[PDB]
Symmetry: none
Subunit: 101 residues, 3 copies
């Protein structure tokens, strides 16, 4: 999840904009930018990843008791993500034969 | 802070909107509304008090090493503290282009 | 620990199965295979050891370079979870009018 710095070089943050040179899936490199102002927020003096508008991602909003907002809210949306794992870590050649160690 | 419910009566929530009838300081009553969609948000299935735009409320934004966004941000109580966040969490390289996932 | 690659030739991933041709200690070569499904887990979109069953939630499995397993993996399933927040925390009655503070 994420993991851009592993495949990108020459990164800089100018104001609220991140710029980097990232590898392509089949070779070459591409310089590109992304404004982080729409995904990061200031919560109590601590930078954080911001959530969703709750009226689009929750159901049955209601008052509970005297002062409580209650809802059934949705978790992070499900998506497909590229990932990799080094098979050298635990797969071995043991007399011509592959096994786990 | 806050605690409207100690001086207000007949509260209701419809959508993102809170409506209540509150006591005026020097006697009498007033029904008013507030939109909770501008101050509350959904964080991975939990409702939380929204933070602030970090550009207009933080100072000295810089990349720290590989993938860290570093700055000093105004706390609730308006005093600056040093804060960092790892951009690798959610910024990915999608075929040469930088994208939030 | 492991490192089959630097001793094994012509490796391929079909589904969850690694098939390669490896050199014996005393002799020539042998082609064997190992099912990785029962040994690699998909944890929220990241391939990991110390678990099983990744193949049910990951697609387009390929060999990247000489020893890397590459895939497109499903992140945690989205679900509706009950949540509450206390409005008293930051909503006040300012002279009969609801305000955020």
């Amino acid at each position: 999840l994420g993991k851009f710095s592993q495949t990108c070089y020459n990164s800089a943050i100018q104001g609220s904009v991140l710029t980097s040179t990232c590898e392509r899936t089949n070779g070459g490199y591409n310089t590109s930018s992304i404004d982080l102002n729409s995904v990061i927020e200031n919560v109590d003096g601590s930078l954080k990843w911001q959530g969703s508008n709750f009226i689009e991602t929750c159901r049955n909003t209601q008052l509970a008791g005297s002062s409580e907002l209650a809802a059934e809210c949705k978790t992070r949306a499900q998506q497909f993500v590229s990932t990799k794992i080094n098979l050298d870590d635990h797969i071995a050649n043991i007399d011509g034969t592959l096994k786990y160690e």
